[PDB]
């Protein structure tokens, strides 16, 4: 079945996957493209000199190890598999509580 095929593909992808190493660990840098879809800017406080903003922060890179050529559909996995992939260590320098 198609479901078993996708499960086999995903299990093959995550097998032998080292999360400690970024894509191209011994080669050129990886390019991480950013998008932001600002939902709202809640409060602009003059007494704390801060401002709260809610955003849809999206990043897009290219990992060659997560490449499959069996199924032709763009897989959408549960949000818990992100604890088993490599994701860039992005941080906001001037944030206080997020």
């Amino acid at each position: 079945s198609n479901m078993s095929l996708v499960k086999e593909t995903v299990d093959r992808l995550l097998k032998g996957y080292d999360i400690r190493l970024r894509p191209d660990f011994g080669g050129p840098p990886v390019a991480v493209g950013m998008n932001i879809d600002i939902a709202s800017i809640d409060m602009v406080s003059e007494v704390n000199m801060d401002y709260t903003l809610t955003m849809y922060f999206q990043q897009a890179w290219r990992d060659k190890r997560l490449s499959y050529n069996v199924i032709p559909l763009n897989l959408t996995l549960d949000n818990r598999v992100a604890d088993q992939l490599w994701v860039p260590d992005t941080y906001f320098l001037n944030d206080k509580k997020s």
Binding site: D18, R22, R65, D89
Partner: protein, 94 residues
């Protein structure tokens, strides 16, 4: 395919590593070379007699159990490797 050789290097580093023992437990006193980079001196709360400060707290010791020999000189690893090795338990006295 540097991924496989670097995975082998990492697994050799953590193979036989005890993160409950400081580096040089028997014949040495560990020397932690610290450093601070204050990115922003926060607002001094006069009511609470406190103050906030946002820092880049840097530490650096010498661990002889993490010597390797590969193509790269410095392994810029992920922040999740830092929990499998020994790291000093610096706490702020105040």
């Amino acid at each position: 395919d540097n991924t496989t050789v670097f995975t082998r290097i990492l697994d050799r580093l953590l193979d036989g590593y005890d993160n409950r023992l400081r580096p040089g437990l028997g014949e040495r006193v560990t020397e932690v070379k610290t450093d601070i980079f204050v990115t922003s001196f926060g607002p001094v709360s006069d009511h609470d007699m406190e103050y906030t400060i946002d820092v880049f707290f840097r530490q650096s010791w010498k661990d002889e159990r993490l010597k390797f020999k590969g193509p790269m000189t410095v392994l810029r690893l992920n922040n999740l490797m830092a929990s499998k090795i020994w790291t000093p338990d610096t706490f702020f006295h105040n």
